[PDB]
């Protein structure tokens, strides 16, 4: 009824969500040339800026994950923007995909943080200058937070895109139900829809960047 | 039904929890105003943090709405 | 099997064997979690 | 209340130290001239 | 509207000029100063000082200590004890002095000379970071 | 010279003098040394004044006297209520630095 | 009916969530006052951020009212 | 009647939302006090913003009371 | 009766809205403390604004209590 | 009885409103700490205002508890 | 029983009011951090006020818990 | 059923408690903005604390959601 | 049963009270960020207070959860 835009799309009985997930990278052409067209120029510029702004903080071991993280911040971003197209199915609105993006990443990061550096890894569970009478619970709280963080990532992205698209759709329905009534009110609701669309573009970009930044900071912590 | 009724009540309740995100964004953007009024040369950089700050405040707010719908429709 | 392993498996190997091992372990954990979920349904 | 003031210094000393640090980190092209223009000859009696 | 007067014991960089914004590294934090700023007076710590002219160009000096004062009439007087333009310095000497001072710190034990050493370290750290 | 001229009739009313001034053109290092010595003297002056020879022209000079306030003076001055981020520590540092500045200025004049 | 009753209750509840936007705009404009009192030369620019700050605070508030009406009429 | 009862309950609930305006005006006038204590020469101008700040805080508060009466009488 | 019951419930609810006035006066007098600690020469004048600030915070609080009694007795 | 039940519910609700006084005293004494750390020479005088500030925050809190007991016993 | 049920509900409600004490201690110790970072020579003295500040914040919190138990057991 | 109904009500209630985390992250990132605007040379280090601060605020928020689901599904 | 139902409701309610601890830790770590950005030489010492501050905020939060479980299992 209302969640028609989030049901796994199928066409002619075929699960066409796979094509929608595969499509974004088709919008990033590459080239072995030296001077190239405008699209690849700007896109290489953006990848350069993003890599610089993200990886810089990491040490020599962290930056090996660079290829990963940048790719991440691209994929998500493109997907999000492709969502804002009419009648489009946004695969980030699915909890499944975000779980599969988060649990492996944060997982492996905590894994490598435990394999080596195990001493300080178990010591990060305790801040530096903690007095004695409050030691035990300060461990368990960190345990819960760490052991849940991937859930936070996945849901924060999933439901955010969900609510964005759902609200845009509801205000659209409202404008529809105000088409046959006061035209100035129809224009006011339309303008609110325009502002919300702009905000949704911004929230797309920002949610991509924030998912990336959070995973990156976890990596930094466990390196 | 009493079930449907309690779904409505719990939905409104879980919705209450968005006041936290409201005040959080209020604080974040107020601090951004102050910090920019102090050291305007850093405006760009400051703005970044602001967005991030915002991006986590709304985060918690989202969870509230989540349960809301996850009670209103999924349950 | 040719130009596939040449244009796919060639570049990725240093990542697929050393950089992404913990990633593979996490993938296994995520798959087991998803299987447990799909079971209890 | 900075740390050195807790230690018993004075901003004159802070300024001397900082000016000296900037004068030493000066390139040898300008170092001798800048040090000359800030050398202290006065003597307490 | 802003009448700026940047000076050193031996040199006058600006005088009664009209800039748009000057950024100073006050001992109680960095802050910017534009026209009609709230009247204040502060002492400096070693740091950059970027002066923005009306046209938009920026002059980046480095001051080791001194005093900034902005008054009711938007008249700013910035006196700096040693005001060097950033080119007259180098990273290697700064880093070496930083190492020497850190070593003396981890060697020293008395509060007076320890504080002196830490001040030197602060100056050198500000140096290295401010350069590049 | 001034110390030798004033020492006889005024010896008790005396804290510190200085030499080596006059041979070399004075520089801020000298003024900083003097300010150091004046602060590290165990004498908190509530007010003070410096007296020099304001140079007017190659033929004319006027003996002038500049005032020198203390921390409590500028602090308690009600007109200092409009100055911002002000506390006793910042005012103390600024007071000391202005003392050195005015000594340097008097020397160069 | 119990359904209509719960609609009213959930409407009032979801309405509670506007206190967050209230406090948020309060904070934003208070910070704007302070930041302008400090660095008045930037007034214009500062004001911009304020509006934006406001524009997001009311944002969250809107969502609350949304559910309100989206329960009062659409459901 | 259960309808009248729920009208009373929803009225009290929607009334709760005035706490946001209360805290908002509190913050605004507190910030005005601080900003004036720091740069009193701007008092007049500052006061203007304050009123405006207030004028939007009460704004949101009004909406709450609105639903209140718009439930108590219009419904 | 269910009516009397809902009157009690709505009274407690509308009473909740006094927390806003509580926090508002808290903020106002805290800011007054700071502003006086910074520019004590203006104490008298500052105090004036404080009272006014207070006089509006309690204002909103009053409205809450209003509905409270205006439900408890008038209805 | 349903009346006694609603008395308990409304009592808990009206009790909720003490969070405002809690945060208010928190803010007041925090500001007192800051203002004293700035201008300690005024400590005595500052403390006075603090008490007064406190004396009004608890004030509003009291009202909440008032209704509480004025529902629990008087009604 | 409906009485026991309402006792549980009112207990949870009156418990809500501890959020005020939570935020109050948060503010107090944050202000203590700032005030000490400014004027560390006064640390000892400052700490005193902090405790006192804390001692009143928890105060209000206590009242909440009071009603809680004073409903859970005494009633 | 009355059990399912109360599960929904308690879920919404326990969800309310996320407003605390919302305001907490708001405050943390606002303070980060200010502290960076004051001493930008420490940006990196400051950011660390911010995350940690955030990491505990969300912490408490989590507990709320915990009970929520631990009532919605486990009970 | 109505008893089990009210246990769930009261559990969610008492859980709401963790928002206070959430905001409290938010404030504490925000103030720690600011205080360190001001006087970084005191970092170590400052951090100590922070932990202590945190150690009391979570304290109150604990009490909430306490009643929660002390209702969910012990009663």
Listed by start position, the domains of chain E span 1-89, 90-132
Q: Give the whole-angstrom CA distance, residue F103 versus residue F27.
A: 10
Phi, psi of I17 (to 5 degrees): -65, 5
Q: Give the whole-angstrom CA distance, residue I20 versus residue H60.
A: 13
If 0-12 CB within 10 Å is exposed, 13-18 middle and 19+ buried, where does residue A190 land? middle
- Chain J nearest-CA distance from I21, in A, is 7
Q: Which two tokens stand for residue J33?
A: 């700490």
Strands E17-26 and E47-53: antiparallel
DSSP letters for chain A: ---GGGS---BTTB-THHHHHHSGGGG----S-SS--HHHHHHHHHHHHHHHHHHTTS-TTGGGGHHHHHHHHHHHHHHHHHHTSTT---GGGSHHHHHHHHHHHHHHHHHHHHHSSHHHHHHTTS-TT--GGGHHHHHHHHHHHHHHHHHHHHHHHHHHHHHHHHHHHHHHHHHHHTTTS-HHHHHHHHHHHHHHHHHHHHHHHHHHHHHHHHHHHHHHHT-
F60 Cβ contact partners less than 8 Å away, ≥ 6 residues apart? none
Q: Do D6 and K39 touch (CB under 8 A)?
A: no
User: Max CA-CA distance within chain L?
Assistant: 60
Q: Do E115 and D3 touch (CB under 8 A)?
A: yes
DSSP letters for chain D: --HHHHHT--HHHHHHHHHHHHHHTB-HHHHHHHHHTT----EE-
Strands E66-70 and E11-12: unpaired
- Chain G nearest-CA distance from L19, in A, is 9
Distances, alpha carbon J51 to alpha carbons A19, I10, I54, K53, K55, in Å: 68, 33, 15, 11, 14
Q: Do G41 and E36 touch (CB under 8 A)?
A: yes
Instruction: Report the alpha-carbon angle A196-A201-A207, nearest 5.
Output: 115
If 0-12 CB within 10 Å is exposed, 13-18 middle and 19+ buried, where does residue A11 land? exposed
Q: Give the whole-angstrom CA distance, residue E55 versus residue M74.
A: 74
Range of the domain at A138: 1-223
Q: Do H41 and F82 touch (CB under 8 A)?
A: yes
CB M28, CB L52: distance < 8 Å: no
Does the beta carbon of D7 lie under 8 angstroms from any beta carbon of chain K?
no
Q: Give the whole-angstrom CA distance, residue L34 versus residue B38.
A: 9
User: According to the entry, how was the structure determined?
Assistant: cryo-EM
Q: Give the whole-angstrom CA distance, residue H57 versus residue H20.
A: 8
Q: Give the whole-angstrom CA distance, residue D20 versus residue D9.
A: 16
Q: Is B60 helix (H, G, I), strand (E, B) or coil?
A: helix
- For F22: left if phi > 0, alpha if psi spans -120 to 50, otherwise beta; the answer is left
Q: Which two tokens stand for residue A75?
A: 């994929």
Q: Is F65 helix (H, G, I), strand (E, B) or coil?
A: strand
* Closest residue on chain H to F86 (Cα): H38
Q: Give the whole-angstrom CA distance, residue F91 versus residue J20.
A: 39
* Closest residue on chain I to J75 (Cα): I8
Closest CA to M61 of M14, M9, M7: M14
Number of domains in chain D: 1
Instruction: Report the alpha-carbon angle J2-J7-J9, nearest 5.
Output: 95
Closest CA to F84 of L27, H42, I53, H51: H42
Does the beta carbon of D1 lie under 8 angstroms from any beta carbon of chain E?
no
CB E121, CB D21: distance < 8 Å: no
Q: Please, which chains are in contact with L (at least 3 CB pairs closer than 8 A)? A: A, B, E, G, K, M
Cβ-nearest to B28 among L5, L10, L26: L26
Residues of J in contact with K20 (CB under 8 A): 18-23, 26
Strands E58-63 and E11-12: unpaired
Residues of H in contact with I17 (CB under 8 A): 15-19, 22
Q: Which two tokens stand for residue M17?
A: 């009270």
Residues of F in contact with I42 (CB under 8 A): 81
Residue given tokens 């005040």 in the structure block: B23
Q: Which residues of L12-51 are buried (b: 16+ CB within 10 A; e: fewer)?
A: bbbbbbbbbbbbbbbbbbbbbbbbbbbbbbbbeebbebbb
- For E39: left if phi > 0, alpha if psi spans -120 to 50, otherwise beta; the answer is beta
Instruction: Report the alpha-carbon angle A200-A66-A32, nearest 5.
Output: 90
CB M9, CB M16: distance < 8 Å: no
Q: Residue E26 pairs with which residues in a beta bridge?
A: E29, E44
Cβ under 8 Å to A: C residues 5-34? 15, 19-27, 29-30, 33-34
Range of the domain at D10: 1-45
CB B71, CB B14: distance < 8 Å: yes
A179 Cβ contact partners less than 8 Å away, ≥ 6 residues apart? A186
Distances, alpha carbon D34 to alpha carbons D19, D22, E83, E87, F27, in Å: 10, 10, 11, 14, 11
Phi, psi of G73 (to 5 degrees): -115, -55
Angle between helices A95-115 and C21-39 (to 10 degrees): 130
Instruction: Report the alpha-carbon angle J15-H26-E36, nearest 5.
Output: 160
CB E115, CB D4: distance < 8 Å: yes
Q: Which two tokens stand for residue C21?
A: 């091992």
Does the beta carbon of E72 lie under 8 angstroms from any beta carbon of chain H?
yes
Q: Give the whole-angstrom CA distance, residue E114 versus residue E124.
A: 15
CB A158, CB A92: distance < 8 Å: yes
Distances, alpha carbon E73 to alpha carbons E2, E77, I75, in Å: 8, 11, 62
DSSP letters for F80-101: GGGSBS--HHHHHHHHHHHHHH
- For H39: left if phi > 0, alpha if psi spans -120 to 50, otherwise beta; the answer is beta
Does the beta carbon of F78 lie under 8 angstroms from any beta carbon of chain H?
no
Phi, psi of E4 (to 5 degrees): -95, 145
Closest CA to G16 of G59, G69, G68, G55: G68
Q: Which residues of A98-133 are buried (b: 16+ CB within 10 A; e: fewer)?
A: bbbbbbbbbbbbbbbbeeeeeeebeeeeeeeebeee
CB J39, CB F81: distance < 8 Å: no
* Closest residue on chain K to L9 (Cα): K9
Strands F18-19 and E66-70: unpaired
Q: Give the whole-angstrom CA distance, residue A79 versus residue A70.
A: 14
If 0-12 CB within 10 Å is exposed, 13-18 middle and 19+ buried, where does residue K75 land? middle
Angle between helices I19-38 and J19-38 (to 10 degrees): 0
Task: For chain E, report the end-to-end CA distance as a whole number of angstroms.
Answer: 33
CB I29, CB J56: distance < 8 Å: yes
Q: Give the whole-angstrom CA distance, residue M36 versus residue M45.
A: 10
Closest CA to D23 of F101, E123, L41, F27: E123
* Radius of gyration (C-alpha) of chain H in whole angstroms: 17
Domains and CATH numbers, chain L: 2-73 (1.20.20.10)
Q: What is the DSSP letter of E8?
A: E
Q: Give the whole-angstrom CA distance, residue A202 versus residue M6.
A: 44
* Closest residue on chain A to G67 (Cα): A167
Q: Is E11 helix (H, G, I), strand (E, B) or coil?
A: strand
Distances, alpha carbon H2 to alpha carbons B1, B32, H5, H67, in Å: 15, 49, 5, 19
Length of chain B: 75
Closest CA to K4 of M71, J53, F10, L50: M71
Q: Give the whole-angstrom CA distance, residue E19 versus residue E26.
A: 19
If 0-12 CB within 10 Å is exposed, 13-18 middle and 19+ buried, where does residue A198 land? exposed
Residue given tokens 């801020």 in the structure block: F28
Q: Give the whole-angstrom CA distance, residue J21 versus residue E68.
A: 43
Distances, alpha carbon A48 to alpha carbons A41, A66, B49, E1, in Å: 11, 12, 20, 41
Q: Give the whole-angstrom CA distance, residue A65 versus residue A61.
A: 8
E69 Cβ contact partners less than 8 Å away, ≥ 6 residues apart? E40, E41, E42, E76, E77, E78
Q: Do B8 and G12 touch (CB under 8 A)?
A: no
Helix (H) or strand (E) holding I34, with range, is: helix I19-38
- Chain B nearest-CA distance from A165, in A, is 13
CB K19, CB J18: distance < 8 Å: no
- Chain H nearest-CA distance from I19, in A, is 6
Q: Give the whole-angstrom CA distance, residue H53 versus residue G33.
A: 9
Distances, alpha carbon J73 to alpha carbons A88, I16, J4, M8, in Å: 61, 19, 11, 28
Q: Please, which chains are in contact with J (at least 3 CB pairs closer than 8 A)? A: I, K
Number of continuous H segments (helices) and E segments (strands) in chain I: 3, 0
Q: Do J15 and K14 touch (CB under 8 A)?
A: yes
Instruction: Report the alpha-carbon angle E53-E55-E59, nearest 5.
Output: 35
Residues of G in contact with A167 (CB under 8 A): 63, 66
Q: What is the DSSP letter of F52?
A: E
Does the beta carbon of E122 lie under 8 angstroms from any beta carbon of chain L?
no
Q: Which two tokens stand for residue E117?
A: 């050493």
CB K25, CB M23: distance < 8 Å: no
Strands E83-85 and D43-44: unpaired
Interface probe, candidates L34, L49, L61, L66, chain M, greatest M C-beta count within 10 A: L49
Q: Is E31 helix (H, G, I), strand (E, B) or coil?
A: strand
CB M32, CB M50: distance < 8 Å: yes
Q: Which two tokens stand for residue A199?
A: 């905000």
Q: Give the whole-angstrom CA distance, residue C1 versus residue A183.
A: 64
Q: Give the whole-angstrom CA distance, residue E99 versus residue B18.
A: 52
- Chain H nearest-CA distance from F86, in A, is 11
CB D23, CB E99: distance < 8 Å: no
Cβ-nearest to L42 among M5, M37, M65: M37
Task: For chain M, report the end-to-end CA distance as a whole number of angstroms.
Answer: 14
Instruction: Report the alpha-carbon angle G15-G16-G19, nearest 5.
Output: 115
Question: Cα torsion at I39, I44, I49, I53 (round to 10°)?
Answer: 100
Long-range contacts of I62-66 (CB under 8 A, 24+ apart): I63/H15, I63/H18, I63/H65, I63/I17, I64/H15, I64/H16, I64/H18, I64/H19, I64/I14, I64/I15, I64/I16, I64/I17, I64/I18, I64/I20, I64/I21, I65/I14, I65/I15, I65/I18, I65/J63
CB M39, CB K37: distance < 8 Å: yes
Cβ-nearest to J28 among I11, I18, I26: I26
């Amino acid at each position: 009824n209302l969640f028609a835009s989030f049901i796994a799309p199928t066409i002619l009985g075929l699960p066409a969500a796979v094509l929608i997930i595969l499509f974004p990278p088709l919008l990033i052409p590459t080239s072995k040339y030296l001077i190239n067209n405008r699209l690849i120029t700007t896109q290489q510029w953006l990848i350069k800026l993003t890599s610089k702004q993200m990886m810089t903080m990491h040490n020599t071991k962290g930056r090996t994950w660079s290829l990963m993280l940048v790719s991440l911040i691209i994929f998500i971003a493109t997907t999000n923007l492709l969502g804002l197209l009419p009648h489009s199915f946004t695969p980030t609105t699915q909890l499944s995909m975000n779980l599969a993006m988060a649990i492996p990443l944060w997982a492996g990061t905590v894994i490598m943080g435990f394999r080596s550096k195990i001493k300080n890894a178990l010591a990060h569970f305790l801040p530096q200058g903690t007095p004695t009478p409050l030691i035990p619970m300060l461990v368990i709280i960190e345990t819960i937070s760490l052991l849940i963080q991937p859930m936070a990532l996945a849901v924060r992205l999933t439901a955010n895109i969900t609510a964005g698209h759902l609200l845009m759709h509801l205000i659209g329905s409202a404008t529809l139900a105000m088409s046959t009534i006061n035209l100035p009110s129809t224009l006011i609701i339309f303008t609110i829809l325009i502002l919300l669309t702009i905000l949704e573009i911004a929230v797309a970009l920002i949610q991509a960047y924030v998912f990336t930044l959070l995973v990156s900071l976890y990596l930094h912590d466990n390196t | 039904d009493i079930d449907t009724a309690a779904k409505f009540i719990g939905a409104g309740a879980a919705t209450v929890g968005v006041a936290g995100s409201g005040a959080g964004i209020g604080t974040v953007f107020g601090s951004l105003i102050i910090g920019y009024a102090r050291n305007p040369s850093l405006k760009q950089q400051l703005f970044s943090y602001a967005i991030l700050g915002f991006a986590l405040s709304e985060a918690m707010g989202l969870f509230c709405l989540m349960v809301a719908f996850l009670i209103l429709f999924a349950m | 099997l040719q130009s596939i392993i040449k244009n796919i498996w060639i570049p990725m190997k240093p990542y697929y064997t050393k950089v992404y091992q913990e990633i593979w372990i996490g993938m296994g954990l995520m798959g087991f979690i998803v299987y447990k979920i799909r079971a209890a349904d | 209340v900075a740390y050195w003031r807790q230690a018993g210094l004075s901003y004159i000393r802070y300024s001397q130290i900082c000016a000296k640090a900037v004068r030493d980190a000066l390139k040898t092209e300008f170092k001798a001239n800048a040090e000359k223009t800030s050398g202290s000859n006065v003597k307490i009696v | 509207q802003m009448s700026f007067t940047f000076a050193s014991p031996t040199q006058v960089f600006f005088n009664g000029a009209n800039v748009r914004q000057v950024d100073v590294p006050t001992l109680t934090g960095a802050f910017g100063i534009l026209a009609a700023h709230v009247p204040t007076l502060q002492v400096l710590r070693p740091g950059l000082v970027v002066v923005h002219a009306e046209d938009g160009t920026t002059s980046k000096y480095f001051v080791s200590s001194g005093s900034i004062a902005v008054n009711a009439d938007s008249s700013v007087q910035l006196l700096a004890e040693e005001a060097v333009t950033l080119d007259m310095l180098d990273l290697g000497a700064a880093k070496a002095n930083l190492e020497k001072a850190q070593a003396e710190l981890v060697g020293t034990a008395d509060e007076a000379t320890r504080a002196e050493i830490q001040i030197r370290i602060e100056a050198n750290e500000a140096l290295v970071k401010a350069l590049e | 010279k001034i110390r030798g001229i004033l020492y006889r009739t005024h010896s008790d009313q005396f804290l510190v003098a200085f030499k080596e001034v006059g041979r070399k053109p004075p520089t801020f290092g000298d003024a900083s040394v003097i300010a150091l010595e004046l602060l590290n003297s165990g004498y908190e002056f509530d007010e003070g004044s410096i007296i020099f020879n304001k140079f007017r022209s190659v033929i004319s000079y006027k003996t002038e006297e500049k005032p020198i306030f203390s921390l409590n003076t500028v602090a308690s001055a009600d007109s200092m209520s409009i100055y911002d981020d002000i506390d006793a520590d910042v005012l103390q540092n600024y007071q000391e630095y202005n003392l050195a500045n005015i000594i340097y200025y008097s020397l160069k004049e």
